[PDB]
Amino acid sequence: ATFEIVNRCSYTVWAAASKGDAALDAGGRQLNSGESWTINVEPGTKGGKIWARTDCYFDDSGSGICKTGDCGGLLRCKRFGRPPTTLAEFSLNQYGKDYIDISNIKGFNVPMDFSPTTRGCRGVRCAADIVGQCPAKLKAPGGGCNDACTVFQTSEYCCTTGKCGPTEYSRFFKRLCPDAFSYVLDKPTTVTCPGSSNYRVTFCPT
């Protein structure tokens, strides 16, 4: 499948694409404002994520640090990033269907639209000013709005027992972005698309 990743933000982001134990495509790249990066994702990829990283510094070897979404100091991410990270999540070609969602379970850093570029399903967006409105206890100094599990590390926020409910903190994310997952057992906002759809992730869509 092809994903076009577009940075519509006024600031540079360092896109990342991983399935947790490997890079997707090159795994990461700098996107200046307006730049588009087209990646190819192998069919059947399960548990892929795309996110943006902010305020990164990398040397010529591709090693460095970002204030949000750092994936072990690498430009080309192999692993998932450090919260807070708005996540585009996808599982492709799963019994003939693709499944996409946006998640705030690991917080929010950059607003995002995640839309098919092929026919037969709708996109999802989380484009509210979550950072601006972020509750004081969840604000990350580096930028971004952390989820409560990251901050507080309780069974309730992290849904460790597989039983958990919404929280004041999950409801904050859900109020601003109803179409994104706000906690682990949120009513799913997954979109089902035809298998082998193509997609565009747009940072700062509005």
Residue numbers in the entry: 1 to 206
Text lifted from the article:
Fixed targets (‘chips’) offer efficient, high-throughput microcrystal delivery for serial crystallography at synchrotrons and X-ray free-electron lasers (XFELs). Within this family, sheet-on-sheet (SOS) chips offer noteworthy advantages in cost, adaptability, universality and ease of crystal loading. We describe our latest generation of SOS devices, which are now in active use at both synchrotrons and XFELs. In essence, SOS dispenses with a patterned solid support pane and simply sandwiches a thin layer of crystal slurry (typically 20 µm thick) directly between two transparent polymer films (each typically 2–6 µm thick) to fill the entire window of the chip.
